[PDB]
Amino acid sequence: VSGSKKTVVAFIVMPAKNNSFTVEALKGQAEVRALENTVHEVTTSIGKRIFDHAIRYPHNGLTTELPTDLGELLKSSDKVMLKRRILALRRPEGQLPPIVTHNMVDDANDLILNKIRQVQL
Amino acid sequence: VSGSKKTVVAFIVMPAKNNSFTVEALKGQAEVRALENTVHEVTTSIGKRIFDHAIRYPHNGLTTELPTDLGELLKSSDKVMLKRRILALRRPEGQLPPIVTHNMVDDANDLILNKIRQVQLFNSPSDRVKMIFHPEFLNANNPILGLDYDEFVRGCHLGVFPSYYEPWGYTPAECTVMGVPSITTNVSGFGSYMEDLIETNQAKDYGIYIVDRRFKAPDESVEQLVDYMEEFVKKTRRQRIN
Amino acid sequence: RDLQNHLLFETATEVANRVGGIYSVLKSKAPITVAQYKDHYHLIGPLNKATYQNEVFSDEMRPVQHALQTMESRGFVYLIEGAPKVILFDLDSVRGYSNEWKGDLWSLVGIPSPENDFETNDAILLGYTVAWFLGEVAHLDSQHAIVAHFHEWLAGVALPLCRKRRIDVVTIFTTHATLLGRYLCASGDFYNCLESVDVDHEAGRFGIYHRYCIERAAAHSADVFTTVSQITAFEAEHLLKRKPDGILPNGLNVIKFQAFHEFQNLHALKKEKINDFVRGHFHGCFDFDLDNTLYFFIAGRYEYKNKGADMFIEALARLNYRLKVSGSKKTVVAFIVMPAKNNSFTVEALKGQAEVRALENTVHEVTTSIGKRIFDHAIRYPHNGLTTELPTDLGELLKSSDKVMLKRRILALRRPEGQLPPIVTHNMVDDANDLILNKIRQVQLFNSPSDRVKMIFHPEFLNANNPILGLDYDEFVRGCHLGVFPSYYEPWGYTPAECTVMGVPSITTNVSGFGSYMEDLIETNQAKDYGIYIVDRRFKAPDESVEQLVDYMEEFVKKTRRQRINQRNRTERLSDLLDWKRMGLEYVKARQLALRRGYPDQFR
Ligand SMILES: O=P(O)(O)OC[C@H]1O[C@H](O)[C@H](O)[C@@H](O)[C@@H]1O
Questions:
Q1: Which of A101, B98, C169, C503 has its CA 20 to 30 A from that of C96?
Q2: Residue C282 carries which DSSP code?
Q3: B235: CA distance to ligand 1 center in Å?
Q4: CATH code for the domain in which residue C213 is found
């Protein structure tokens, strides 16, 4: 209502009978972790390209002290990787981030979860 | 003359009397190291920005999976430090990369340096061959070229040992053991031994180049040595590797 | 007509649409055919309205444009490395002519055509259309000799008539299997009692009758008849009642490295990724040495009998016994990569990778503090009472808090008492009824520590986007040591052929089209040294075949590293033989022979 731009992420840390973490929980952590590593790879090559330009300037037809076009730094193979990682992070259409990290033993009767489902958060 | 795109950097590793490395040799390594570090900081920032875009797409007005404009990744403070690092690498106007890594004790009278000066290999940009005299034993403890001798050799493409007196060529032998082709002479004990075992035209293919310093005038020897060198420079990578 | 400056028309169902294994063959072969024919080369296929958008003249070539115009006159769509020119005919824009045509066909050659056989329907439509098109060209172009190559029963409806209508163009037909062959190989002895089978009856019994005809017709109608491998030639002789004029083995578009030994480095790199996975999978039960461990794998479509999953698993159980008996210190981790119906990765799979990944991070932390301490000592010596150049007591470097976190990480890796590393990475939809898992359970390969052979079913396509084994298929292979593909029905072994190209030795069979090609080129004992192991599945009982397969695995396990390395070099040099640069010559020979047979202008 107040048009606040802030977000609140509310954690409930109360032990309940469960069957460990959900596949989704672990899978998403990994998917992001994969994206982190690919970016680290891509930046390293960008670094080699920036460095080459910097050590080489003003020779070999380099008008500018630094690269100015992203194309000089970012190559199609780099892009393909990054795009693959981004695709892996996609959620099925209409699926929302869950309200629970674990597989519950008695999910339908759980008080906390039923409360959340009642207020529709 | 041939319009070759190749470059040859030629090292001379022969100990002479010296007063250690030049300030310029050390300062230039540091200036380049400082550039590498600055680049590493800048690519870290870039990473965070690429990552943020990737994780957030297609939300928050992100059309396109990836950044498309360099401005999104590279920012003014990043550019400033990079430029500062580049500026520090600038040499005085008209100065050329030296032909020696050390402060020689007897610079003016040195035979090697005088010869270079005489043939006028001063590492000008139009020179397709470059000269670097390292008047000291290679050692991994050295602060500019932190390699032991054996390591350095492995790094190189071609050993060139056109000896006149050499009962046994320890050097081109060690060079061969490291899988690096060499040029030797037929008045060299090593070159003689290799001349004996292999047909001299077949020996070039096994990376053994032998110069005639026996049945040829010193000026013909040289044109042979040069013929060899140029032949090698014409080689492709695949050929070099094989 | 000019024979030297000829035209080339290649036709297949699989042209712009990836329905099956011919797609890849045509695609990979494009660069060499384009390289030779330039603009003269055209691919022809059916228009796949759904996905054709994805994949997407000169005067001496002018007759084409008018023939297309003529086809456009009567109410057609004109890519991949080599970028060959394509013609995709919209079959919906001609569906109405079918009844006239299906009848034409029925009286034409007595090829029935049930209304249900939607695939045959399309096959026919295509055939009549293409035959019509080529016929147009044949008149309209008078300079060039024309070559019309056709792939598979589905595309070979245009062939039959070209003999009937006596069109001036020369024809080639290649079959990449046989209909009866597949169908007999329904359950089970194909290769032995083959010569003694009835083509017409058994077809009628299978219920193709109509589709069998179209294949047989195509094979007979064709000026030149070809298969992809000896074993299939033998098969096609007795089943399609025509000995083929030759073999057209499937080549690959081999990507050569500037440095020959680069594949060797790639192997080591990819193997590190598999090691990483394996460490996680065996978290808590990790009692062997990866430096002395070998990675075997089978891969392909889930075809338990056909692709030899049964023989593989049986053999592995036997090998396991041999290695235990012989006291071998080696370990073999056997992967099965065959897609099955699953509910994705197991929590345990993901959790163990995480647990290891956390250990790695804590170690990395601990080692950096150790570093600061080693450094301090080194830079300080000999001052401040430092007797020695380096630390000598681990206590100086490793502190209590460091030990605590490490210990916690180790604890998190523990598995429940008696629990063994799984034999499957995924939650299966129908676990109890799964054949592979049944077979594994039966031979009792449950990854116990005393087992020298380990089992890991991965019932899903490999993909670098996977969260546990983050490798594309090609990478995974490189990483492994031995591919093992003991197939039964396989007109051409795409798999062990790919495996060879990655410099990885493989076990194949003599009933496999690939294995047949290799047993012809190389003396079979000499071939093992080039990393091609061929199992006898023709002149041996299944039990003997298994024991042979085991012998081969045991032989390979006994190899040293140096030997393994060298053999891989040997197998990679061999990958040349599978390059289109060499395999495309057989296509040439087939095409030139096709000229000599039909329009033989030259005495010599
Ligand atoms: O996987 P293996 O058969 O033990 O191969 C091990 C070897 O792989 C490649 O050849 C690497 O270049 C070697 O450094 C490594 O030692």
A1: C169
A2: T
A3: 29
A4: 3.40.50.2000
Give B15's contacts (C-beta < 8 A, 6+ positions apart).
B135, B136, B137
Q: In the structure encoding, which two tokens stand for residue B109, read together?
A: 């009278």
Count of Cβ atoms closer than 10 Å to residue B103 Cβ: 15
Among B39, B67, B70, select the one facing A69 at the smallest CB separation.
B70
Partners of chain B (3+ Cβ pairs below 8 A):
A, C
Q: Check: CB of residue C479 under 8 Å from CB of residue C556.
A: no
Burial C322-351 (b: 16+ CB within 10 A, else e): bbeeeebebbbbbbbbbebebeebbbbbbb
Structural domain harbouring C139: 2-253+583-598
> Could C260 and B241 be called an inter-chain contact, meaning their C-beta atoms sit closer than 8 Å?
yes
- Read off the tokens for C458: 């991965």
Which positions ≥6 away from A100 have C-beta within 8 Å?
A: A22, A113
DSSP string, C327-380: T---EEEEEEE----EEEE-HHHHHHHHHHHHHHHHHHHHHHHHHHHHHHHHHH
Phi, psi of B222 (to 5 degrees): -55, -55
Phi, psi of A81 (to 5 degrees): -55, -65
Give whole-number Cα distances, C432 to C121, C300, C424, C441, C457, in Å: 40, 22, 13, 10, 14
Interface partners of chain A (CB pairs < 8 Å, 3 or more) are B, C
What are the tokens at C478? Answer: 């490189």
Distance C485 CA to ligand 1 centre (A): 23
- Residue A92 burial (CB < 10 Å; 0-12/13-18/19+)? exposed
> 């066909």: which residue's tokens?
C105
Distance (Å, rounded) from C-alpha B152 to C-alpha B154? 5
The token pair at B10 is 């030629």
User: Which amino acid appears at position C443 of this protein?
Assistant: V
Check if the beta carbon of residue A82 is closer than 8 Å to that of residue B50: yes
Contact B69, B49 (CB under 8 A): no
| Elucidation method | X-ray
